[PDB]
Amino acid sequence: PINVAIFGSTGSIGTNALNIIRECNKIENVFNVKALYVNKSVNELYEQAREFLPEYLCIHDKSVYEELKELVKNIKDYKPIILCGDEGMKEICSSNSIDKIVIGIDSFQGLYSTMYAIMNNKIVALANKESIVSAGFFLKKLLNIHKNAKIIPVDSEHSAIFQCLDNNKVLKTKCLQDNFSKINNINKIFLCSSGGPFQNLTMDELKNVTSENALKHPKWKMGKKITIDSATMMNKGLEVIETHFLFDVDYNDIEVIVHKECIIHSCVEFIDKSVISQMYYPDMQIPILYSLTWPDRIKTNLKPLDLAQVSTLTFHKPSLEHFPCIKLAYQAGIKGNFYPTVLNASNEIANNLFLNNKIKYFDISSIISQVLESFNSQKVSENSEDLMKQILQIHSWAKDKATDIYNKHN
Amino acid sequence: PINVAIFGSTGSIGTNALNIIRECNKIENVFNVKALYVNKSVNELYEQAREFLPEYLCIHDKSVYEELKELVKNIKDYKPIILCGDEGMKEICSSNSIDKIVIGIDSFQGLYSTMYAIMNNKIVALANKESIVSAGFFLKKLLNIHKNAKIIPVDSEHSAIFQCLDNNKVLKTKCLQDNFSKINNINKIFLCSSGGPFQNLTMDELKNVTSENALKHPKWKMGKKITIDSATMMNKGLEVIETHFLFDVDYNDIEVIVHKECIIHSCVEFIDKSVISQMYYPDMQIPILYSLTWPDRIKTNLKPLDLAQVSTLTFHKPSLEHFPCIKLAYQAGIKGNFYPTVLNASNEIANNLFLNNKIKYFDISSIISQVLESFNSQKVSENSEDLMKQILQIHSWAKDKATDIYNKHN
Ligand SMILES: CN(O)C(=O)C[C@@H](CP(=O)(O)O)c1ccccc1
Ligand SMILES: CN(O)C(=O)C[C@@H](CP(=O)(O)O)c1ccccc1
Ligand SMILES: [Cl-]
Ligand SMILES: [Mn+2]
Ligand SMILES: [Mn+2]
């Protein structure tokens, strides 16, 4: 039995996790959902509790906690431990009946839970890549202290890369640890991208694309923020840095490749030059599922890949002139220090402005470029708590700087 | 330092093995070529001996044995053990100073060295699919007895499949052992094929193809016999049965896919429906190398795959009407018993007839089909040597039968 907690259980990743768990458990009873944690959606948590009957329930919003207790009374033969706020989150993390925790919470709250999962030596199925991009240093330090803690990637390209590895080697190291590449004989990564909706556009057409254009025909079902990032290819830029940190691959050895059919999810080139790749329909259930079964696999009733029907797969290089966010990402990542934090934070702002029709496509990369240019390297704290504060402070500064640039721009 | 013997060193597999060995050794000293064995090409063996200076030399044909000595006399500072025939082959296989044996003698003669390599508990890097097809059950029996022997596949599609597997699972089983696919969580195999030169021919055009046509512009550089089998897709038919025996995959779960770019070498679908595939340019050096380094990989300086340049990859189902040898292979595999032995033997004859312009394209399948039709199942001998004799008997019968059908037809 695999004992799993889901943090952010009503979000996109959390609901998809519960769905694949539900379907796999119908084939063979494999998963015990031990804990559910949601922010404010008390009715939804009740509905999930009702079905999965976890040992622990936690609602963050303290205002709705009594309500939740009332609701859950109505579930027969069920007496969970019902908690609330950060304190309930920490109690769940410390439970020895939980082996794996899905982090389906974004933003800072997600980093805080991640930290507690790591501090409790858990397997952390991490779907918030922004924490890896912005706080990579902090997570690396934390994983060095907590030896048995492991981050398993859920972002599809990174899951794919992870799935292309030999677990006989993987088990001698772990993600976000120096030497992961050496131990796994990794030479190079092909990081695949859908390319978004603008691949064939000229620079003059790109100048006038709108967020309505950007949210059209996404190849995956996803939130607005990531969909804008897909259109600018900043999503892939961020994913380049995620790759560097998870797998200890040099920036030079990470190649972004536009694969519009979204069947090959990424590929790993090993030192002999043999390449291995992972393929499936664009469906988040596979990467989520693997993060819960690794190092095993279990039976599903997902539709099998029909290669003959797919028929054709295509690959081309992205143009850095048309997708300058990609260049900025490499530049920030290579510079290192806290430039990735700055890149991520300034993009948060620039992305939202474009989403809301306040700036134009090349304004996004312009703003980000300017914030990056304004930032001066800071000495990296050795102290873990000081380091975390540095990251938050720089993140906050970068958001304000991005906003100030927008505000001062006519 | 890996100690290697090459059986059939002057064939396409052998020369490719020496080349990748030579190149890897220029990076770092990794392989010792301990032994070279050829059927009768003295001048070529002598050139190989001059460069690699192996401890052992073996020429099967004794009529050219003294000639070999006379040639090797010339090489200075070099006093190798110069053996001949089956006896020298046996002496090489049982030497302690040999860890891995590359079998690149495809002729059913290669069965013998395969056997002796297994009997001496070696790692057998096997590129003689005919022995697996004809004697699979026998080899399985032998591997059950010799617990430390391992067959590592060299045939490119089977190396690909093997490379897509998690060695943390592989090491709990071995090729040609019951339950290999269960232990490795294998649901299905996409067995890729170049398709040969005749994929786009109509039925009428196919009726007329000659061996000249078939040997034209092939996607891989190999011997005539396999190049003809590639044209008829009987090579893929044999490889279906090879897949069944190596990995214990049901015939129902093996799908042949025509992939004309020859970049994806085959794919594995796991029980969760995730697919993993192995890719490289069409170059036998990678699968050979992996068989010699498994469970590890080592650095090469081979050209890195450039996916963007390759640009497009395509997949389609083969037409069984155009390629009836595929259907015959499945039918023989599904029936089991000694039908694969008969399939392989009859094809040896039919292939050579076509190669030599004695029969037509559809005469190949017709002959094979008729020989299969004329065979009745036999009691499988439980004694291992009785079983070998049975296999040689039936193989020899099937060749005679196929020759008779040809001789009697106008
Ligand atoms: C699934 N996954 O891991 C993603 O990163 C989804 C991205 C893919 P990309 O950045 O366009 O390559 C995406 C595509 C389309 C719309 C929104 C996001
Ligand atoms: C490399 N390898 O493992 C082979 O089986 C070579 C075959 C490939 P196929 O049977 O055409 O798919 C082949 C293709 C073209 C010419 C000769 C052989
Ligand atoms: Cl999302
Ligand atoms: Mn992604
Ligand atoms: Mn092959």
Swiss-Prot record, chains A, B:
Cofactor: record remark: Binds 1 divalent cation per subunit. Mg(2+) or Mn(2+).
Keyword set includes rRNA processing: no
Family: Belongs to the DXR family.
Protein localization: Plastid, Apicoplast
Protein role: Catalyzes the NADPH-dependent rearrangement and reduction of 1-deoxy-D-xylulose-5-phosphate (DXP) to 2-C-methyl-D-erythritol 4-phosphate (MEP).
Residues engaged in binding NADP(+): 10-13, 39-41, 130, 223
Description of how activity is regulated: Inhibited by fosmidomycin and its derivatives.
Keyword presence, Manganese: yes
Binding residues annotated for Mn(2+), in chain numbering: 155, 157, 239
Oligomeric form and interacting partners: Homodimer.
Recorded catalytic activity of this chain's protein: 2-C-methyl-D-erythritol 4-phosphate + NADP(+) = 1-deoxy-D-xylulose 5-phosphate + NADPH + H(+)
Protein known as: 1-deoxy-D-xylulose 5-phosphate reductoisomerase, apicoplastic
Shown part of the complete sequence: 77 to 486 of 488
EC numbers for this chain: 1.1.1.267
UniProt-annotated binding residues for 1-deoxy-D-xylulose 5-phosphate: 129, 156-157, 194, 217, 230, 235-236, 239
Cofactor(s) required for function per UniProt: Mg(2+); Mn(2+)
Species, as recorded: Plasmodium falciparum (isolate 3D7)
Gene Ontology molecular-function annotations: 1-deoxy-D-xylulose-5-phosphate reductoisomerase activity; manganese ion binding; NADPH binding
Gene Ontology process terms (BP): isopentenyl diphosphate biosynthetic process, methylerythritol 4-phosphate pathway involved in terpenoid biosynthetic process
Alphabetically ordered keywords of this record: Apicoplast, Isoprene biosynthesis, Magnesium, Manganese, Metal-binding, NADP, Oxidoreductase, Plastid, Transit peptide
GO CC terms: apicoplast
Pathway(s) the chain acts in: Isoprenoid biosynthesis; isopentenyl diphosphate biosynthesis via DXP pathway; isopentenyl diphosphate from 1-deoxy-D-xylulose 5-phosphate: step 1/6
Class in the EC hierarchy, top level: oxidoreductase
